[PDB]
Amino acid sequence: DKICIGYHANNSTTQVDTLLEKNVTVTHSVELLENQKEKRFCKIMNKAPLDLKDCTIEGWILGNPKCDLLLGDQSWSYIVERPNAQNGICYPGVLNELEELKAFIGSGERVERFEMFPKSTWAGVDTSRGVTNACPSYTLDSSFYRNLVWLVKTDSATYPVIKGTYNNTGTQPILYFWGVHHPLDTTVQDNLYGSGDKYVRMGTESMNFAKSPEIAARPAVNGQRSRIDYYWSVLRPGETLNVESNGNLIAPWYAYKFVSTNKKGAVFKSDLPIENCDATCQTITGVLRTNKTFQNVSPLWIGECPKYVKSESLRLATGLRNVPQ
Amino acid sequence: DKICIGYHANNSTTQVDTLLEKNVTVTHSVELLENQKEKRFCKIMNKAPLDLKDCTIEGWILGNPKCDLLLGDQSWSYIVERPNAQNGICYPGVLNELEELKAFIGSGERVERFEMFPKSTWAGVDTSRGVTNACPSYTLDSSFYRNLVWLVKTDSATYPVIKGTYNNTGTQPILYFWGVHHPLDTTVQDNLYGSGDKYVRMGTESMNFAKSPEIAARPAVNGQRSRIDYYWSVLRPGETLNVESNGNLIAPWYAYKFVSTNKKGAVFKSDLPIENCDATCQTITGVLRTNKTFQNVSPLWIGECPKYVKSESLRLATGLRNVPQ
Amino acid sequence: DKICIGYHANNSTTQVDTLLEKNVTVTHSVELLENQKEKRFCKIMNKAPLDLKDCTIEGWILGNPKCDLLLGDQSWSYIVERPNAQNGICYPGVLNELEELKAFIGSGERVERFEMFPKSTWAGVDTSRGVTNACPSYTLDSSFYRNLVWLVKTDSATYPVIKGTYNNTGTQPILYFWGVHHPLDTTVQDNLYGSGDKYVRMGTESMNFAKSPEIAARPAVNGQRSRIDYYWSVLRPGETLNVESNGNLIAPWYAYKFVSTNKKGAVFKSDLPIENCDATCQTITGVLRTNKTFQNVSPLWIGECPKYVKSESLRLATGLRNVPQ
Amino acid sequence: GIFGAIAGFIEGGWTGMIDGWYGYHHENSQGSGYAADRESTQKAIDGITNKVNSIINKMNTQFEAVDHEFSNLERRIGNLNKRMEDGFLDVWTYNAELLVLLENERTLDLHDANVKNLYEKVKSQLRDNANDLGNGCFEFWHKCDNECMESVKNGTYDYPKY
Amino acid sequence: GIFGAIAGFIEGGWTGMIDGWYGYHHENSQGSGYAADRESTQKAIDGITNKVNSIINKMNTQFEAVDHEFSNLERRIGNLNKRMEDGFLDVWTYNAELLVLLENERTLDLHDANVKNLYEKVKSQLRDNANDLGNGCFEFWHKCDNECMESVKNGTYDYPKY
Amino acid sequence: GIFGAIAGFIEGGWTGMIDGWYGYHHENSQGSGYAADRESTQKAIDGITNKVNSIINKMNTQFEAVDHEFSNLERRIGNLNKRMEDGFLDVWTYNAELLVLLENERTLDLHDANVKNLYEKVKSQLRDNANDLGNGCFEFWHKCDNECMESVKNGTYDYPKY
Ligand SMILES: *[C@@H]1O[C@H](CO)[C@@H](O[C@@H]2O[C@H](CO)[C@@H](O[C@@H]3O[C@H](CO)[C@@H](O)[C@H](O)[C@@H]3O)[C@H](O)[C@H]2NC(C)=O)[C@H](O)[C@H]1NC(C)=O
Ligand SMILES: *[C@@H]1O[C@H](CO)[C@@H](O[C@@H]2O[C@H](CO)[C@@H](O[C@@H]3O[C@H](CO)[C@@H](O)[C@H](O)[C@@H]3O)[C@H](O)[C@H]2NC(C)=O)[C@H](O)[C@H]1NC(C)=O
Ligand SMILES: *[C@@H]1O[C@H](CO)[C@@H](O[C@@H]2O[C@H](CO)[C@@H](O[C@@H]3O[C@H](CO)[C@@H](O)[C@H](O)[C@@H]3O)[C@H](O)[C@H]2NC(C)=O)[C@H](O)[C@H]1NC(C)=O
Ligand SMILES: CC(=O)N[C@H]1[C@H]([C@H](O)[C@H](O)CO)O[C@@](OC[C@H]2O[C@@H](O)[C@H](O)[C@@H](O)[C@H]2O)(C(=O)O)C[C@@H]1O
Ligand SMILES: CC(=O)N[C@H]1[C@H]([C@H](O)[C@H](O)CO)O[C@@](OC[C@H]2O[C@@H](O)[C@H](O)[C@@H](O)[C@H]2O)(C(=O)O)C[C@@H]1O
Ligand SMILES: CC(=O)N[C@H]1[C@H]([C@H](O)[C@H](O)CO)O[C@@](OC[C@H]2O[C@@H](O)[C@H](O)[C@@H](O)[C@H]2O)(C(=O)O)C[C@@H]1O
Ligand SMILES: *[C@@H]1O[C@H](CO)[C@@H](O)[C@H](O)[C@H]1NC(C)=O
Ligand SMILES: *[C@@H]1O[C@H](CO)[C@@H](O)[C@H](O)[C@H]1NC(C)=O
Ligand SMILES: *[C@@H]1O[C@H](CO)[C@@H](O)[C@H](O)[C@H]1NC(C)=O
Ligand SMILES: *[C@@H]1O[C@H](CO)[C@@H](O)[C@H](O)[C@H]1NC(C)=O
Ligand SMILES: *[C@@H]1O[C@H](CO)[C@@H](O)[C@H](O)[C@H]1NC(C)=O
Ligand SMILES: *[C@@H]1O[C@H](CO)[C@@H](O)[C@H](O)[C@H]1NC(C)=O
C-alpha cells in the first residue's frame, strides 16, 4: 500500500529560455510577441486612409492640375504617399518649410477647400494668362496650380499695387499658400510685371512676410530656368490676412479649412495596397491583429499597437519543466 | 515541556503587492513615493523668485512702461509668469528668436540695468518724440519702452547716418535689444524718416545684422497697422558693438548686465501664490517636503527633487506576511 | 568511518556586493567594466586619423594659406582638431551653417580637391589682386584662401555681370564654398566693385541663393572693419551649378569631391598624441583594449566600444561565498 | 531546480495525471489512480496568472516613433531623433528579454518548491506509519483504504489510529 | 511562500512576540513566554535595510524635464522633446513599479526561508530528545528547565545529557 | 544564505578540495581525502556560465553619444541633446548596477541550494545506516571501504547490504 507525490507531464515540445539554461521544454507557456502582419492598409476607427496615388503631398495640396482626382474636401485617418508619385511641384521651385508642412498636415483629419481670394480681388491686372507648359493638366498642355493664381500685367499699363483681405470669421484655422516668381532674366521680368522694384508683402496679427524677386538663370527643370518660391501659413480663427503686392505675386486663390486631429496622425510612404477592411492597429508595413503585448514588425504605426521590440521571441513559462517518462 | 518556533504578527493593515499576489498585509513596510504638495511658490537657496505679476517676459525685459514696478536690477532663483499677464509687446510686432530668449533668461540669476547708449549718442536726430498711444504708461497716454528709443527725423532735415559704439569692458555678458520700424504706408515713412532707401545695420566681432523697412498695411493691433521687428542679442566680455543706421531704427537705450546661473533655472507659467517660506524642492505645481525617493506630482521643478513617476504608490515590504491569530 | 558533504574555499580576497550584503568575499568572480585607457589616438580599421595640427576645420576646408600642409586630397577614419589651433577664418566673417558643415564633414571618409571654376571663367574682371594682410601665407604677407578667389574690378570699367557653370557629371557629391564681401564704407565698395546695386546669385536644381552687400563698419578683427559672409553647399551627382554675379563675389575656385562614410565618423577636439598603432575602439580620451562589456572612460567614441556607464565597478559573482578555515 | 524535487529526487513527471500540476498516485487493495492536489495547483495557477498579468500591465505603454522628415540642413536634429528612437528601442528590448529570462528561471523554481512542500506535507503527516522510499513514494506499514488515502490528500490523516 | 513555513506548517504568527521577527515560545514548570531570536532577526534587519538603501541609492538620479518653448514652425522638435520626456517617464515608472513587485516577492520569501532555517536549527539540536509535532513545536521527552530552554535558543543544547 | 547550508550548518569551506565547488570528505581504514562531486559542480558551472553570457549578450548594444555642435541660438536643442544623452546614461547605469546586485544575491543562493541538495542526496541514501552529525558529516554504523564510499558519491549506495 503506497502513496506517491508527483507532478504533471504532457506531450509539449514548446521550449523557453532561462538565465541558467537554454531550450527547456515546459508543460505550459505563453508567447508574448507578435511577428505576423497583413501586408495592406485598412481603415482606422472605420475612417478610411487617403491614398495620394500618383500625387506627392506638395502636388496634392498646391493643387497640381494632374491631381484633380484629389481636389477639394478630404477626410482621412492617415495619409499614404506612394514612392513613385510623379505629380508634385511641376513649376520648379522650393516649398518653404516643407518638413514642417508635412508635420502639420499629418496632425490633421479633414480639409475643406474654399475660395479665399476670388480672381476679381486683384484690381487692374490679368488673372487668366497665368499658365505654363511645365504644369500640364490632363487636357491642356499649359495650366497651373488650382489653388494658386499666377498674376501678370495687362495690356500695357504698369502692374499696379494690388491688395487683398480676408478676416477668418470661422472656428477653424485656414491652411493657405502663395508664391514669389523669380524670372531667369530682366526682359522676362519686364514682359510680365513691367519695370520698377517689385515686392510681395503679407501680414496678419501674428505674422509678417516680405520678399523681392531675385533675377537669375537657374539650371533648367521641366523646361524652366525661372523659379518660384512657394510659401504656406496658417490663419488662426479671428485673425485676418492682408496681401499687398506690386509684382511677382503668385496669389492665394483657394485654401483649406483645417480640422486638427486629437489622435496621432501619420504619413506613410509605402506602395502597399489599400483594401476594404478594418483595423485597430496599423503599422507602415501592415496590419496587426493581436492580443499580444509585444511586436517586432514596426516602430511606426497609427492606432493602438503592441510595444515594438527587436526580439524574435518572448516566450514566458507558465507550466513546469516537462519531464515525461 | 515544549519549545515552539514562530514569527512576529501585529495589528498592521498596511498592504503591498508582489508579482504573485496582490493586497498582502505585512508587518512592516516603507512607502517610497510622495504625492503631497504645498500649492505655493517659495524661496530656493533662500533666494526669492521673481514674480512678473501683470507683465509677460517680453514686457518686462523690453521695458514696457506699465512694468515700471519691475524696471531695473533683479535677482531671482526662478521666474513666475502669470497666465493672464496683459502687459507684453504693446506696439505690435514680432520679437525675433523669442523662444531662445526665454531659454537664455531662464539660465540667468541676476540682471543689472544700465544706460548703454545715451540719447545724445545719435547725432542730428530727434530722441524725444518717440512715443505712441499703443504704449501707454500709468500716467501718460502715449509712451514707449524704457529700454528702447524710437528715433525720428528733426525739423526738416533728411534723417542722416547715425552711429553708436560700446566696448564691453566688464566681465559680464550684456543682454540688449533693438528694433526696425515698418510703417503702414509711404507717407508715414516720409513723415518720420524722410525719403531714400533706409537701413539698420549692426555688428560685433562675432555677429552681423542688416535689415530694411518693409512698408505695408498689416491688420490693426492695439490701433496700429504698422509693425516693429524687435531683436535681441548678447554682447560678450571684450566684444564691442557698432550701430549704423540712416532710418527706421528703434535704438538700444538701456541694457542688462547678465549673470549666468550655475544651477538649473526655470520659468514657471502659473497662477500659484508666492509666499514667505523656504524650500529645497520646488515644482511648478507646488513645494515638496520629503525624504522620499519618488514623487508623482510634477516632472517640472527647480531645486533637488525626488524622481518623477506616474505611480500612485510604491510600497516596499520590509517586514513579513502578517498572519495574526 | 565517515563521509562529509562540503564546498570549495580558497585564498581569494576579491569581493562583490549583493542587494542584502556589501563586501562579500567570493571564490570566483568576473569584472565586467573597463576603466583603463591608452591616452593616445590610433588608426581605426588600419586607416589613420586626420590631424589638423595648427588649423581649425574652417581654415583647413576653406584653404587658409597657412594650412598648405593639409591642402589637397585627404582620407581619414576620424578627425582630430586641436584646441589651440590659430589658423581658421583669417579674414573676419561668419561661415554660415557652421555646425551643419562640421556634421557633414564628420560623416565623411575622403575628399578629392579639384579645380571647379578656373579663374578664366569670369569674363572681364580681375582675378589676381584678391589678397589681404589679414590672410598671410608663410611666405607672403598678403594672400587668400586657396579654395576661393576674391574678384575685383579691372582697370576702370564697371565690374560687369559674370557667369559660371558646372555640371557634376561624376558619381560623388561635391562640397564647395563661396562668399559675399561686405565693405566697411561706400568708397571701398566703389574702389573694388564700382557703382550700382550689386548681387550674388547662385542656383542648382534644388537650391537657390541670393544676397546683396551690406555696407557698414564692424569692429576691427585681424585689422579689418569689413566682413565676408562665407557659404557652403553640396552639389549632388547629376546637378549643375550656376553662378551669376555683378559685384562682391568671393568665387568658388577649388572644391571637394566628397566620399560619404558608411561607418559613424567623429570629430574629436583633443590635444592627445597621434601615434603609430592600431585599435578597434577609440574614445576621445584614449584607446580601449578590452573584452569587457562595460566601460566608464567616455560616451564619445569611434569603432566598436563597450557600453558606457558611470560605475566604478561591475563585479559579478561566479563562485560561492569564500569561507576558509 | 534549486529545491531538488522536479527532475531530482522525483525523477520524472506523470503523463497520467491530467487534471493539475501537482498531485498524487495511490495504490491499495481497491487499485490505482492519479489525483491532482487542487489546493496547491489552484494557488500556483493564481500566482502565475497574477505574474503574467502584472508583466503584461507594466509593459502596457508604447514609445511612439514618428517619421517626421528632416532637410539636408537638419542633419544634427535628424540624427538626434534617430539615436533617441533607437535609444528607447534598445532599453525596451533589453527590459523585455531580460525580464523573460529572469522570470522563467523563478517560475520553474516556484513549481519545484511547490512539489517539494507537497512532499513535505505528506511526510509530516505519515511519520512512523509509512516508509519514505526517497523518490516521493511512501509505503504504508498499515492498510490504507480509499478513505485513508483521501485523508492524506486532504491533510487530515489520523496518526493515532492504525 | 516557497519555503513552506510562514502561513504554512506554522499556520500563524505571534502577536505576543513583540521584540523581533523570528523567535520562540517555551513552556515548562516555571511557566510560559515569548522570546525573539536576536541573531537571525538582526541579520534579517541588516539585510533588508541594505536592500532598501541600495534601491534608494540606485534610484538617486533624476531625469530633468524643461519647459523650453517651441514656435509653431518648430512642431517637429517640440514633439521630439515631448516624446523623449514621456519616453524616460515611462521607463522609470516601469523600473520602479516592476522592481517593487519583484523585491516584495523575494523579501517575503527571505522571511519564510529564515523561519524555516530557524526551525531546522532547533530540530537538528534536539533529535531524539523531543517529539516534532509538525507545527513548529517540539515536545521534550525530558524535563527542560530555564537553562535547558536557553541552551536551545543560543544553540548550545547538550544532547548527551538528559 | 536562504537555504541554510553555506556558512550555516556547514560552518566553513574546504581549502583542501581544489577540483570543484561541491564535494566530499571521506574517512575510513584506508585513510582520508577530498573529492569533488563532478555532476553537481559541472551543472552549476554550466548554469552560471550561461547566466554570465546571457547578461553579456543582453548588454551588447551601445547608446551612441555624438558631439555635434550647437550655436548660441540653438540653446534649446543643444540642451535637448544633453538631457537625452544623460538620460540614457542614467538608465543604463541603473540597469547594470541593479542587475549585478540582484544577480549576485541569487548566484550565492544557487550555490547554497546546491550544497543543501547534495547533503540531502546523501542523507536520503544512508538513512539508518549512518548517524547525521548535523554539520554535513555522517558517521557510518558499518564499515565503509573505498568502494562503499564511491557508491555513496556516485549515488548507488546499496542499503539492503551492511
Ligand atoms: C478528509 O477525508 C476524510 C476521509 O475521506 C473525510 O472523513 C470522512 O467523512 C465522512 C463524512 O463527511 C465520513 O462518513 C460518515 O460516516 C457515517 C457512518 O459512520 C455516516 O452516517 C455519515 O453520513 C458519513 O457517511 C467518513 O467516515 C470519514 N472518513 C474517515 C473518518 O476515514 C473528511 O471529512 C475529509 N475532510 C475534509 C476537510 O475534506
Ligand atoms: C547558552 O545557554 C547556557 C544555559 O543558559 C549557558 O550555560 C550557562 O552558563 C552559566 C555561566 O555562564 C552557568 O552558570 C555557572 O554555574 C556555576 C556553578 O555551577 C557558577 O559558579 C558560575 O558562576 C555560573 O553561575 C550555567 O550553569 C550554564 N547553564 C547550563 C550549563 O545549563 C551558556 O553559557 C550559553 N552560551 C552562550 C554562548 O550564550
Ligand atoms: C558506483 O560505484 C560502485 C562502487 O565503486 C561501482 O560498483 C563497482 O563496479 C565494479 C565494476 O564496474 C565492480 O568490480 C567488479 O568485480 C568483479 C569481481 O567481483 C570483477 O571481475 C569485475 O571485472 C569488476 O572488477 C565492483 O565490485 C563494484 N563495487 C561494489 C559493488 O561495491 C559502480 O559501478 C558505480 N556506478 C556508477 C554508475 O558509477
Ligand atoms: C504666365 C507665363 O508667362 N507663362 C508662359 C511661361 C512663362 O513666361 C515663363 O515660364 C516665365 O519664366 O513661358 C512659357 O514657355 C516658356 C518657354 O521658354 C523656353 O526657353 C523653354 O525652352 C520652353 O520649355 C518654355 O519653358 C511656359 O510654358 O511656361 C509659355 C507660358 O505662356
Ligand atoms: C513717434 C510717432 O510717430 N508716434 C505717433 C504714432 C506713429 O506715427 C505711428 O504709430 C506710426 O505708424 O502715431 C500715433 O497715432 C497714430 C494713430 O493712427 C490712426 O490711424 C489710428 O486710428 C490711431 O489708433 C493711432 O494709432 C500713435 O499713437 O502711435 C501718434 C504718435 O505720436
Ligand atoms: C583685394 C583687396 O582689396 N585687398 C586689400 C584689402 C581690402 O581692400 C580690404 O580688406 C577691403 O575692406 O585692404 C588691405 O589693407 C587694408 C588696410 O586697411 C587699414 O584701415 C587697416 O588699418 C589695415 O590693417 C589694413 O586692413 C588688406 O590688407 O586687406 C590691402 C589689400 O590689398
Ligand atoms: C536550441 O535553441 C535554438 C534557438 O534558441 C533552436 O534553434 C535549437 O533547435 C534548440 N536546440 C534544441 C536541442 O532544442
Ligand atoms: C474682422 O476683423 C476685424 C479686425 O480688423 C475685427 O475687428 C472684426 O470684428 C472682424 N469681423 C468679424 C465679422 O469677425
Ligand atoms: C485590493 O487592492 C485595491 C487597490 O490595489 C484596494 O482598493 C482594495 O481595497 C484591495 N482589496 C482588499 C480586500 O484589500
Ligand atoms: C575696446 O575695444 C577695442 C577693439 O576695437 C580694443 O582693442 C580695446 O582694447 C578695448 N578697450 C578697452 C578699454 O577694453
Ligand atoms: C567595503 O567596501 C568598500 C568599497 O565598496 C571598501 O573600500 C572597503 O574596504 C570594504 N570594507 C571591507 C571590510 O572589506
Ligand atoms: C549636364 O547638365 C544638363 C542639365 O542642364 C543635362 O541635361 C546634361 O545631360 C548634363 N551633361 C552630362 C554630360 O551629364
Nearest CA in chain A to F55: A19
Does residue A284 contact residue A268 with C-beta atoms inside 8 Å? yes
Ligand 2 pocket check: which of E37, E154, E159 to mutate, most ligand atoms within 8 Å of Cβ? E154
Does residue B127 contact residue B133 with C-beta atoms inside 8 Å? no
Residue nearest to atom 3 of ligand 12 (CA): C167
- Alpha-carbon gap, residue E66 to B302, rounded angstroms: 10
Residue type at D6?
A: I
State how far the alpha carbon of C105 is from the alpha carbons of C273, D38, F106, in Å: 22, 70, 50
Burial class (CB in 10 A: 0-12, 13-18, 19+), C311: middle
Best residue in D2, D70, D131, D137 for a mutation probing chain F (most F CBs within 10 Å): D2
| Residue-range domain boundaries for chain A | 1-41+276-325, 42-275
Q: Regarding beta strands B307-308 and A267-269, do their DSSP bridges make them parallel or antiparallel, or are they unpaired? A: unpaired
- Alpha-carbon gap, residue B302 to B282, rounded angstroms: 5
Say whether F51 sits in a helix, a strand or coil. helix
Does residue F149 contact residue F28 with C-beta atoms inside 8 Å? yes
- Alpha-carbon gap, residue C59 to C299, rounded angstroms: 28
Nearest CA in chain E to F79: E66
Write out the three cell numbers for B281.
524642492
Nearest to B181 by CA among B141, B133, B136, B148: B148
How far does CA A191 lie from the centroid of its chain? Answer: 36
List residues of E whose CB lies inside 8 A of any C CB.
47-48, 50-51, 54-55, 103, 110
DSSP assignment of A86-154: -BS--S-EEETTHHHHHHHHHTEEEEEEEESS-GGGSTTSB-S---BTTS--SS-SSB--TTEEE-B--
Atom of ligand 8 at shortest range from CA of A240: 2
Burial class (CB in 10 A: 0-12, 13-18, 19+), B208: middle
- Structure solved via: X-ray
Helices D75-126/D38-58 angle, 10° precision: 170
Atom of ligand 7 at shortest range from CA of A17: 5
Does residue A92 contact residue A219 with C-beta atoms inside 8 Å? no
Residue type at A242?
A: N
DSSP B69: T
- A192 Cβ below 6 A of ligand 4: yes
Nearest to D63 by CA among B88, E82, A325: E82
- Per the document, the length of chain F is 162
Q: Which residues on neighbouring strands pair with residue A302, listed in sequence order?
A: A282
With cell 527706421, the residue in question is B248
With cell 516649398, the residue in question is A95
List residues of F whose CB lies inside 8 A of any A CB.
47-48, 50-51, 54-55, 103, 110
Nearest to A316 by CA among A24, A72, A1: A24
Number of Cβ within a 10 Å radius of residue B275: 11
Residue C244 alpha carbon to ligand 12 centre in Å: 19
Nearest CA in chain E to A98: E73
Contact E51 C22 (CB under 8 A): no
E-chain residues near B1 (CB < 8 A)? 27-29, 139-140, 142-144
Residue type at C36?
A: Q
E-chain residues near A97 (CB < 8 A)? 73
- Per the document, the length of chain C is 325
Contacts of F158 (CB under 8 A, 6+ apart): F151
Write out the three cell numbers for C297.
572612460
Write out the three cell numbers for E67.
519647459
Cα distance between the two ends of chain C: 23
Nearest CA in chain F to A20: F47
Q: Regarding beta strands C307-308 and C294-295, do their DSSP bridges make them parallel or antiparallel, or are they unpaired? A: parallel
- Alpha-carbon gap, residue B303 to B280, rounded angstroms: 6
- Per the document, the length of chain E is 162
Atom of ligand 6 at shortest range from CA of C152: 1
Atom of ligand 10 at shortest range from CA of B238: 14
| E40 φ, ψ (degrees, to nearest 5) | -75, -30
Return the number of CB contacts < 8 Å for E and F: 55
Residue type at D19?
A: D
E-chain residues near B318 (CB < 8 A)? 48, 52, 107
Atom of ligand 12 at shortest range from CA of A220: 5
| B277 φ, ψ (degrees, to nearest 5) | -155, 170
CATH class of B1-41+276-325: mainly beta
With cell 579691372, the residue in question is C154
Does residue A81 contact residue D53 with C-beta atoms inside 8 Å? no
D68 shares contact with chain F (CB less than 8 Å) = no
Q: Which residues on neighbouring strands pair with residue C166, listed in sequence order?
A: C241
Return the number of CB contacts < 8 Å for B and E: 201
**Nearest CA distance, F30 vs chain D (angstrom):** 30
B-chain residues near A163 (CB < 8 A)? 217
User: Domains in chain E, ordered, with CATH?
Assistant: 1-162 (3.90.20.10)
Best residue in E3, E63, E80 for a mutation probing chain D (most D CBs within 10 Å): E80
Does residue B31 contact residue B314 with C-beta atoms inside 8 Å? yes
Say whether C246 sits in a helix, a strand or coil. coil
| D137 φ, ψ (degrees, to nearest 5) | -105, 140
Count helices and strands (H / E) in chain F: 3, 4
DSSP B273: P
**Nearest CA distance, C64 vs chain D (angstrom):** 25
Nearest to A222 by CA among A105, A66, A78, A116: A66
F39 shares contact with chain D (CB less than 8 Å) = no
With cell 544553540, the residue in question is E155
F129 shares contact with chain D (CB less than 8 Å) = no
Contact A324 D25 (CB under 8 A): no
**Nearest CA distance, D109 vs chain C (angstrom):** 20
CA dihedral A24, A25, A30, A35 (to 10 degrees): 70
Q: Regarding beta strands D137-140 and A79-81, do their DSSP bridges make them parallel or antiparallel, or are they unpaired? A: unpaired
Resolution of the coordinates in A?
Answer: 2.6
- Alpha-carbon gap, residue A76 to A259, rounded angstroms: 11
Which CATH topology does B42-275 take?
A: Hemagglutinin (Ha1 Chain); Chain: A; domain 1 (3.90.209)
- C240 Cβ below 6 A of ligand 12: yes
After which residues does chain E show a gap where C to N exceeds 2.5 Å? none
Say whether D36 sits in a helix, a strand or coil. strand
Contact B215 A208 (CB under 8 A): no
Say whether A216 sits in a helix, a strand or coil. coil
Number of Cβ within a 10 Å radius of residue D60: 12
Q: Taking a contact as any Cβ pair under 8 Å apart, which residues of chain C between 94 and 133 contact chain F?
A: 98-99, 102-103, 106
Write out the three cell numbers for B199.
537701413
Does residue A278 contact residue A245 with C-beta atoms inside 8 Å? no
